[PDB]
Amino acid sequence: MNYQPTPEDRFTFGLWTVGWQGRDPFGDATRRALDPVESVRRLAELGAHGVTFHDDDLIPFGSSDSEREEHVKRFRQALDDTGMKVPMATTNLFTHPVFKDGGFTANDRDVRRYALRKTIRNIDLAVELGAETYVAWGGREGAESGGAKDVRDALDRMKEAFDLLGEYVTSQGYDIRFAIEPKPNEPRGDILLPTVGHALAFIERLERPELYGVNPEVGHEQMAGLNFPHGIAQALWAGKLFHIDLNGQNGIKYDQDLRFGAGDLRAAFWLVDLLESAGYSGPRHFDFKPPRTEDFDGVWASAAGCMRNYLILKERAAAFRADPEVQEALRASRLDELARPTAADGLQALLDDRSAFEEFDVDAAAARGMAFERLDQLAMDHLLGARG
Amino acid sequence: MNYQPTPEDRFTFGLWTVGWQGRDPFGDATRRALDPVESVRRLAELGAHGVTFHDDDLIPFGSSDSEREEHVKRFRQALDDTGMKVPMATTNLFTHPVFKDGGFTANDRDVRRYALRKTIRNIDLAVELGAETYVAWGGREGAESGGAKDVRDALDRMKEAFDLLGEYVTSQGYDIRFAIEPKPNEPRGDILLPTVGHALAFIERLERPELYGVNPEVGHEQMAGLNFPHGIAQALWAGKLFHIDLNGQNGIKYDQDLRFGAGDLRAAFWLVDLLESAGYSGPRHFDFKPPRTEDFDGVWASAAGCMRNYLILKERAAAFRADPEVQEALRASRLDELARPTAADGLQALLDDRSAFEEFDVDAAAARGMAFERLDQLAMDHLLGARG
Amino acid sequence: MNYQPTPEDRFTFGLWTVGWQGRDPFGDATRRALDPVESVRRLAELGAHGVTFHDDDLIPFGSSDSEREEHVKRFRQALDDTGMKVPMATTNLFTHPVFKDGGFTANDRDVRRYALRKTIRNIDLAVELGAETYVAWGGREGAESGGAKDVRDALDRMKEAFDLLGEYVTSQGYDIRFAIEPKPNEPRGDILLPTVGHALAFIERLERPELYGVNPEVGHEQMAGLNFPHGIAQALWAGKLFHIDLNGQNGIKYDQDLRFGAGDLRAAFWLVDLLESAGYSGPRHFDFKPPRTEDFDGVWASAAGCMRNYLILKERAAAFRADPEVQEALRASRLDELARPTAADGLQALLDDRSAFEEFDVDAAAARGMAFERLDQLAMDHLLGARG
Amino acid sequence: MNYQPTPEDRFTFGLWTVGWQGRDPFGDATRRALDPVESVRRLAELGAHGVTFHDDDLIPFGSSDSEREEHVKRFRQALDDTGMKVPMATTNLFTHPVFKDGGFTANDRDVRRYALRKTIRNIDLAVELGAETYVAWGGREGAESGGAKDVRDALDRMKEAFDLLGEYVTSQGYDIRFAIEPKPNEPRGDILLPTVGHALAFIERLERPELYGVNPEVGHEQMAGLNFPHGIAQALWAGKLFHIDLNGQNGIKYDQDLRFGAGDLRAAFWLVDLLESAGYSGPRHFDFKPPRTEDFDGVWASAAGCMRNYLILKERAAAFRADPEVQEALRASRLDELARPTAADGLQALLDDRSAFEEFDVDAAAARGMAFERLDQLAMDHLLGARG
């Protein structure tokens, strides 16, 4: 009756996660670098399904086409020896000083062109490795001051970039879709497309909207004090949840990247409840950082905890929905009615329906209790395994 | 060389603003109620262009069709005697206990139908009074707990409601457009369509998207720690800025509704700069609350301050853009290049362009300073009128 | 193996909590008023230990000395019939319009004098009913603008008020201590003594510091994004934790007053762990509001949930500390060393200790892992009852 | 009629400020390192009064006693050639991996002893260079998880450390005082002594409280959503404002370290108003970071802007207080009464004063307007130089 993960659970990790050396804005690294091959081997042993990477994680910046080839080959052999897959890949358009003002929206045009070329080159490699989703996190797209960036022009440049990438994949005949990852701030004072909503609205203005979805991250939405499960529900509603990044965050402050389960525990429960209920079948990707206080043993314990926590919550959420007492409580709170159309009878019928206004007893309706507190306590008991 | 407003400036106020009695969650009212006619007369004298209202502001809840008529007539006479217009109207779907779980997304179906009827009835009246925009603020659409609301079903109910209203105006042949007003939280723990982005994405899923835009509020986006000017830029970019609510907020906390100019002053400057540059021609509506510490004299001084502050900032922003030294600074920071297409030459040309990657000198590009701090200090000097 | 509370658990509730009618800044009441006697009877049945009140909760504002007497008598009989105690009392210096600019720090001197008299009168009554702690929440002490309040003068007025109350209790020979309750904002834009720290520092400037402590509230510190357990640890460290208010809050936003256990669940666990470990023996007081969506059945279910959640967490925290595997993990993370003095040998010895600097192997020390992630996952397993 | 600074203005900068290379958690450095001598020379030319440093800024970590001497000598010559002073110094107890779990509160005892030795060594050097204040920012004192740090034990270790440093300076006969710099979070999940209040309360528990004060930073308090001017007022009230760090922050998010004047402009105005009114005579120290988008020209423009903004605000604040119309407004709002004792007549007199309760006309007092909005608009006009 434990919680051991298997590749069937689709848990994935970025190379940059367990490979984070611990360098923060106020301190040097506390851990030596990991060879991508060792990370692949270590994660496979923990039960992971696959890994993800930024170009610069796999092939050091400025590498020769041959060195590049050696790096890819070694990586490939490790995937072969372990059965690990690579479901997603992304580009590093934030580390090098050249991207200090952005990649796709840098004020310098020559920088923008370079950003597009670097991305296109990695898209080819991502397809080669079997990736189905290509993520784009515009970490440097934004500003610290108001006159430094004209946002309308920036959005034109952002759209131009994404349309060109869409023109490329469709002309190469690749079966890869894009996922935009929003973040409200950090490293820039304010980042463009700050939340899942802004990203979703942006996509509807692209030439080929069908190729783009979102890759929301638990901590990012929480940095704006937003309800993550709700944001995900809207993304699923729009049919745009192509991928998802899981981790923990303790409120509005810098991006902590704690292991999944840490941070807002109740939000994690409602998240798992939703993903499992909605039948999300994409990867359960962890974009986290084992704290710099830890040594390598601590790194792997942190990675294992991510998966363990998701499995415990999945169990608790399933028991919650399957509890007949909860099913009756959901009806007591009228969740069944929320699912029924307000007016399937039509506009005219509604306007002619005296029970809807003229003869509506507003006071009687008002006095009805929603019974939400009883339902929420049942949810609490289930989460804590306190159903007596 | 002062800052006196005239109806030409299009400043408008909600009846509920200067009419706020001062009742908060911890205290009773500190001011007597204002008769809507006195508010109209007082605002006209201050230089306002018009007023806005919720049905329940103009006609007390539960009023008879005749009493209702008397109220409307008196209101009309005042508009006639002062030349004040009514450019926007909205529905109160949050005050009465019956809307405790929402209006359009209440779990109770009968409540949802009642919400739609109450709105439709006020839409007729809004057209009668000359309103061009009908705002919808779903203040009660949301939840305090996770199992109380299935967000996918709620969004279906929300879409159903808006589609029906769109079917109504188009069948009556009204020339009125809708504007959704987002808010992240308060009075509900979490409100649906929490920011401008979520609202924009939602609109693209409606049957007739052209009838809907957004009505963003300065303080609402700031309650999520977001950059208001940026949110507005995206709304303008999408061509969805139908109306706008101005006020002040001091960070992430309860909705303060301070007078415009108060709160984040630099954000207000960049907001006015953008609205004036973009040629926004809609009303400059103030949705604020004169603090409960004030008597009536203080109320009008607060209302007058709203307009005064907008006029001072408009002047400073105009002087900023017109300063040749600022124009050269904008070029030094490459704002001119941000406005130029990244690749008007096309995909193939980009892929064949060696100057874009193979021969791109990343180090030389990286060493270029953006000169953003000099530009921002010029912006500061202009705002403070310290250009020496 | 359930979680039923008994008066031995010292759980208490404010009359204003289960008695909250549901009126918020955007809506009317959804519940009828409760007679204080019914609340006492209902809470006793749930297993509560006692109740608390503001003067204005028990005796309506403006009541005659006789009516006042009738109210107190009825209240007394109910306490007698149920065995319920009244361990704390407080003053309402925030509701009436006269306190719009504060009570003890109102700019108007006559208001300040009135505030002191109203408090003194209720202190006599609190002693009469057996209260041991008198709480002071300066909800109106603060400002929305910078020039409205000179904070140095305000702090002089605040100190003057508290010193006078201290002079009163000591001259009447009462055995009652004061507890200041901080809150960062709401209803004022910014409230004086915004956090537990500011309150603690203030107390050290009073004439008789021994008579004053703090009454921290879970949600208040969380409104400033602070770690509640840490704030409590500092209050205990200083020996100033006289009382405590428990509830739930979901981050930085308006004061939600959710039932205890809701909001930040992990913070609640670490809070209970600390209170039980430290041997806190004061009341476990709930200052919450059953959401306005609920009817009376929902009110009592919410109140019962408060106590249930505290009892489940107490169990989980106890099992955590008692787990030998956790005890070894605490040693692996060097919590035992944190408890040992850094230099009991003294300054001179430290300066002459070459192993402390000259011969200190900084690299070897640096490479030691803290093992915090393993320890935190054990804490997680225990909380979720997932120890396999 | 400009705003040129002179050493008389007491503006100081940390070497680490204009010397920040631009490395953030997501990117490499964008600027080459500055030699401390060039920074001293450059700042002197801008009109600065002096500089400050962390040991590790001046003498590279791991330097030999001789190399150390060469570094100090060169630094000294530059101070001599420019007339620049060094009013404050501090220790770097956060960068090196050995301090990953803290310096004074690290769980490892040997690390704590090493932290104390490193500090003591730099205290000697700070005195040698003429520093009057020694700052302590416990950037690594805290935790990411609840069981990793027992806060009561940590506070004992923190007190032990500070007492030992106090025993050292008093035994060496140094004329140097300490200033604790609070910060709520970053780089640790939660930092001990998170705000000015927690630091002030802590100091009162030290053996020799007179040797310790606070060194508040604009951005730090704003990271907890607190009112900076209010925090400063309380620190001045307690006589503990030994030093102050100025910069800009845009709300609750990562520590931006923008130049002074940027961020919350109105808060900066009220801050300068208070410091100048209170007669603060200590240094006006800038702890900021010129954004990584800038080259060296941009660095110096950013540094110059810090001082320019403080001088403009000082002018506007002075004109505000000197305006007879503002003086009358302050009386209209009863600021004069806030400054008068509530009860200089004493407790007994208050209790016998019928005008204070029995015969107090609460309704008449309640109806008095505070006139705060008019006063705040005058403050606004003055700030914007819009007094017509």
Distance in Å, alpha carbon of D114 to nearest chain A alpha carbon: 18
CB contact under 8 Å between C305 and A377, yes or no, is yes
Interatomic CA distance for residues A79 and B199, integer angstroms: 43
Does domain C1-388 bear CATH number 3.40.640.10? no
State the best of D21, D92, D96, D144 to mutate against chain A, taking most chain A CBs within 10 Å: D144
C233: region left, alpha or beta (phi > 0 left; psi from -120 to 50 alpha): alpha
Are the C-beta atoms of residues A318 and B139 closer than 8 Å to each other?
A: no
- Burial profile D316-346: b = 16 or more Cβ within 10 angstroms, e = fewer: bbeebeebeebeebbeebbbebbeeebbeee
Distance in Å, alpha carbon of A244 to nearest chain B alpha carbon: 18
The token pair that represents A10 in the structure block = 């689709």
Q: Does C385 touch chain A (CB under 8 A)?
A: yes
Instruction: Give the burial class of A380: count Cβ atoms within 10 A of its Cβ; 0-12 exposed, 13-18 middle, 19 or more buried.
Output: buried
Q: Does C28 touch chain B (CB under 8 A)?
A: yes
Q: Does C349 touch chain D (CB under 8 A)?
A: no
CB contact under 8 Å between B237 and A152, yes or no, is yes
Give the count of beta carbons closer than 10 Å to the beta carbon of residue A83.
10
State yes or no: is D230 an active-site residue.
Answer: no
The breaks in chain C (C to N more than 2.5 Å) occur after none
Q: CB-based contacts of A56: which residues, under 8 Å, 6+ apart? A: A92, A95
Give the count of beta carbons closer than 10 Å to the beta carbon of residue B371.
21
| Closest CB to D335 among C110, C111, C150 | C150
Strand order in the sheet with C133-136: C212-214, C177-180, C133-136, C85-90, C50-54, C11-14, C284-286, C245-246
Q: Does A171 touch chain B (CB under 8 A)?
A: yes
Interatomic CA distance for residues D301 and B373, integer angstroms: 7
Chains that touch A (3 or more CB pairs under 8 A): B, C, D
The DSSP-derived string for A161-221 is: HHHHHHHHHHHHT---EEEE---SSSSSSEESS-SHHHHHHHHTTSSSGGGEEE--BHHHH
Chain D environment of B365 (Cβ under 8 Å): none
Q: Does B139 touch chain C (CB under 8 A)?
A: yes
CB contact under 8 Å between C114 and D365, yes or no, is yes
Interatomic CA distance for residues D357 and D366, integer angstroms: 14
Give the count of beta carbons closer than 10 Å to the beta carbon of residue D12.
27
**Range list of β-strands (E), B69-209:** 85-90, 133-136, 142-143, 177-180, 190-191
Three-state DSSP at C81 gives helix
Chain C environment of B91 (Cβ under 8 Å): none
Between A and C, how many CB-CB pairs are < 8 A?
122
State the best of B96, B123, B151 to mutate against chain A, taking most chain A CBs within 10 Å: B151
Interatomic CA distance for residues A173 and A154, integer angstroms: 29
How far are the Cα atoms of C275, C283, C379, D360 from residue C306, in angstroms, in the given order? 16, 14, 22, 41
CB contact under 8 Å between C293 and B100, yes or no, is yes
CB contact under 8 Å between D147 and C333, yes or no, is yes
Q: Which residues of A are catalytic?
A: 54, 57
Distance in Å, alpha carbon of B352 to nearest chain C alpha carbon: 49
C245-246 and D11-14 beta bridge pairing: unpaired
Chain D environment of A23 (Cβ under 8 Å): 25
Chain B environment of D372 (Cβ under 8 Å): 291, 293-294, 298
The DSSP-derived string for B102-137 is: -STT-SSHHHHHHHHHHHHHHHHHHHHTT-SEEEE-
Distance in Å, alpha carbon of B61 to nearest chain C alpha carbon: 12
Q: Does D107 touch chain A (CB under 8 A)?
A: no
The DSSP-derived string for B265-303 is: HHHHHHHHHHHHHTT--S-EEE-----TT--HHHHHHHH
Three-state DSSP at C236 gives helix
| Closest CB to C28 among B97, B148, B293 | B97
What pairs with residue A53 in β-bridges?
Answer: A89
Are the C-beta atoms of residues A386 and C3 closer than 8 Å to each other?
A: yes
What pairs with residue D88 in β-bridges?
Answer: D52, D133
Q: CB-based contacts of B239: which residues, under 8 Å, 6+ apart? A: none
Question: What was the resolution (in A) of this experimentally determined structure?
Answer: 2.0
Chain C environment of D192 (Cβ under 8 Å): 230
The experimental method is: X-ray
CB contact under 8 Å between D108 and C334, yes or no, is yes
Distance in Å, alpha carbon of C1 to nearest chain A alpha carbon: 8
How far are the Cα atoms of A1, C373, D148, D244 from residue C319, in angstroms, in the given order? 20, 19, 17, 46
Are the C-beta atoms of residues D228 and D271 closer than 8 Å to each other?
A: yes
Q: Kindly report whether the peptide bond that precedes residue C187 is cis, defined as omega within 30 degrees of 0.
A: yes
What pairs with residue A241 in β-bridges?
Answer: A214
Q: Does D327 touch chain C (CB under 8 A)?
A: no
Phi, psi angle pair for B99, to nearest 5°: -95, 20
Distance in Å, alpha carbon of B143 to nearest chain C alpha carbon: 10
CB contact under 8 Å between A254 and D255, yes or no, is yes
Q: Does B107 touch chain C (CB under 8 A)?
A: no
Chains that touch C (3 or more CB pairs under 8 A): A, B, D
CB contact under 8 Å between B301 and D373, yes or no, is yes
Between A and B, how many CB-CB pairs are < 8 A?
324
| 3-state SS, one letter per residue, for chain D | CCCCCCHHHCEEEEHHHHCCCCCECCECCCCCCCCHHHHHHHHHHHCCCEEEEEHHHHCCCCCCHHHHHHHHHHHHHHHHHHCCEEEEEECCCCCCHHHCCCCCCCCCHHHHHHHHHHHHHHHHHHHHCCCCEEEECCCCCEECCCCCCCHHHHHHHHHHHHHHHHHHHHHHCCCCEEEECCCCCCCCCEECCCCHHHHHHHHCCCCCHHHEEECCEHHHHHCCCCCHHHHHHHHHHCCCECCCEECECCCCCCCCCECECECCHHHHHHHHHHHHHCCCCCCEEECCCCCCCCCHHHHHHHHHHHHHHHHHHHHHHHHHHHCHHHHHHHHHCCHHHHCCCCCCCCHHHHHCCHHHCCCCCHHHHHCCCCCHHHHHHHHHHHHCCCCC
State the best of B162, B234, B269, B280 to mutate against chain A, taking most chain A CBs within 10 Å: B234
